[PDB]
Amino acid sequence: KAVWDWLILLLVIYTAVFTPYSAAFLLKLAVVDLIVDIMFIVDILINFGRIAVHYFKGWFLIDMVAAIPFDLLIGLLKTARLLRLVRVARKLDRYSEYGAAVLFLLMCTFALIAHWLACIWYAIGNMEQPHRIGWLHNLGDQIGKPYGGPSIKDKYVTALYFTFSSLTSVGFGNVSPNTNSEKIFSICVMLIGSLMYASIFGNVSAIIQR
Amino acid sequence: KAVWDWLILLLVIYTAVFTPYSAAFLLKLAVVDLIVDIMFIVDILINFGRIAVHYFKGWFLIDMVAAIPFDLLIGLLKTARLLRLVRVARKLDRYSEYGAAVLFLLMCTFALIAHWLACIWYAIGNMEQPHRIGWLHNLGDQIGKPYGGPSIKDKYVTALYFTFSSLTSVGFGNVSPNTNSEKIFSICVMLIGSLMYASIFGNVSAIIQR
Amino acid sequence: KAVWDWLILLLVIYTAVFTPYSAAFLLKLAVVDLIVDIMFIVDILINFGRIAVHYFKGWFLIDMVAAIPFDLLIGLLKTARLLRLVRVARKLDRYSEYGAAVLFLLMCTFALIAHWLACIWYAIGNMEQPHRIGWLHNLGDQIGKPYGGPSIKDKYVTALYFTFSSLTSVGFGNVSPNTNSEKIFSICVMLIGSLMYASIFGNVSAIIQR
Amino acid sequence: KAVWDWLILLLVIYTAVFTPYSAAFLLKLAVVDLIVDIMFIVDILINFGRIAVHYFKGWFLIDMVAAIPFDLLIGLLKTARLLRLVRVARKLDRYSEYGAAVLFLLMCTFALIAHWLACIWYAIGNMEQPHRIGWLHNLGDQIGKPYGGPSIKDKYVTALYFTFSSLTSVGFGNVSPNTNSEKIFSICVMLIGSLMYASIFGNVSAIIQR
Hints:
Four copies of one chain form a homotetramer.
Chain A: H1 4-26, H2 30-47, H3 51-56, H4 61-67, H5 86-90, H6 92-95, H7 99-128, H8 135-142, H9 152-167, H10 180-209
Helix pairs in contact in A: 1-7, 7-9, 7-10
PDB class: transport protein
Keywords: drug toxicity, potassium ion, hERG, cryo-EM, membrane protein, transport protein
Assembly: tetrameric
């Protein structure tokens, strides 16, 4: 039970890494998804004589709708598995005991936000690709893979690197927005970064200053 | 009167967004402008029998000149409506109790500063076109507009994105100053961007812990 | 007496702005410089029988050399007037009586550091005349004035803009170091600019609250 | 004894500068490092009978492995000498007695982190070169030394300048990551640089006033 919370947190991080990635890139492992689904079913069963009503009156519908699959584009309904991130929100008291723990959580949420923004950036670039101005075409031209096109590894790495440069306000200039939708996404990313980078690294400076 | 105060704040935001955009881009719907003008006249009437003398010798001498229609260049003279921004700067106590409202107002005024700088940047760029040097010519080249140049949407989005990149100290390298006017404007933008970035984001970091 | 010190501050700002500029650029008006010298001699004269020995044992040794003419490559010795900058390094207690004065002084010294680094950058770019490599050639190609070469206005504006971008960590990419001397100078600029940016803007964020 | 340990710190900085540099670049005079290791052996002898056994039970192994010559991948074994950096890592209570000394050590450790990251970057470039995607090819194209190729001076200066730009979040755009290995290394460098920049410069801003 004491170590079960950390396992649940690790599974939540795994699903928050691999659900947006799968939806954005792989839609176009299954056994691991089945295993984590079984583990989350075990956890929701564990969460439950007089405590049943208490759990029913709060944070039961969310877990019930998250655990049950939508397996009857039917694969897009699997994006609802992101609701499991609320579990770490309702148990933040146990995860905030150690300064190392909260520092690792801050780095993890920085990486998670960067990964989600990379998934959105790739989705935009792919939805604009069939309709030589987007970032995918320039990236393919600059790595010797003219549009075929770059591999999934190259596309994901480029998107994550661009998102990290935009969030950290580096702007290497290798890849830059060139379409109106890309420019608006970049502006929104600039606002999001200016907020979250400032807040998170202020918290980090507070932690180290302790 | 609180609902009226927040409605007046919304109208002030609307005019601060749409009069400099109009002056910069549109010059070479009216129903919304007429409705907002009527609402501001209603507000100045509501502002007022003992307090009438008090308000007459106060902000009335500014509100009257900010509300008089100049329909006797009229398009350039309509910029005097920017004096309505003092209607919210004189009642900071009304908009400083929610806590999150302060953060929202700070982020909104950051966006408004970016929008005003974008309007000034477009005004600088457009006045240099008749004279491939300049941000407008390069922007048209990037998309494929033989500057028949880019549409108003593309020009505004590019200007806003460049201003946000300069203010956030990213420097994407897609849009860069090349003329001495643009270079001096960018130096001034860098100075005021450092100022506003430091002050505003130190403030928001201050409230983020509360 | 009170007015005299602020006038001396204005004069020292003038000389700190126009001595490095003249040395860096105009090596290849005099009446204003002569009037400035007259005022500085007047200041040394008023700076004075009991206190005469006190001043003689104090700052007189450094003050006298910085103001006596070195008239006889002979113009390279003119930089001696830069030693007058310490005259305002001893009346901080009088120049910091108002917070707005502190803010103005901080922005003035930031701009002065940018100006001095721009002069050094131009000297570095101009000493590389014997040998497409270098910022001056790139700038001359950018603004459509191939080497001849860009005017002094364009060269100074480009140098100041590059120095400001380096100090504020924007990195527009219009001008980038491309030579070993330029790269080493840029590394030193990055180090000192990060240090002074952090210090100055932390102090500024402290000032705005106070 | 103070001068002895200050010389210890100086030679520790020397080896931290010159061992990774040699390992990365100079692989293909030794008198300086010969005297340095002789001096380290003399320090070991000085450190040593009541306290000799106590210190033997303590750190004796650390300066035993990092001092014994490996003369007999064969030449790469000298990288074990970087373990001498912990000699100053056990005397922070003494090396942090002065605020100016603290700032000097912070600047030195920032420069050392940049130097180590530049060595790693150059090692990546060299292992990728024989396989224009690499940064070394682009560097050779920029300067007048097309691939032969740039000399060791140019390569090291470019690596250090790029690493400093990445850490300081400038993004000059002259040299930018272009391969998957370079992009991943740049993401890691962005994270590391953000963290260390925040911590170190928060500390520095905490020292400037005092």
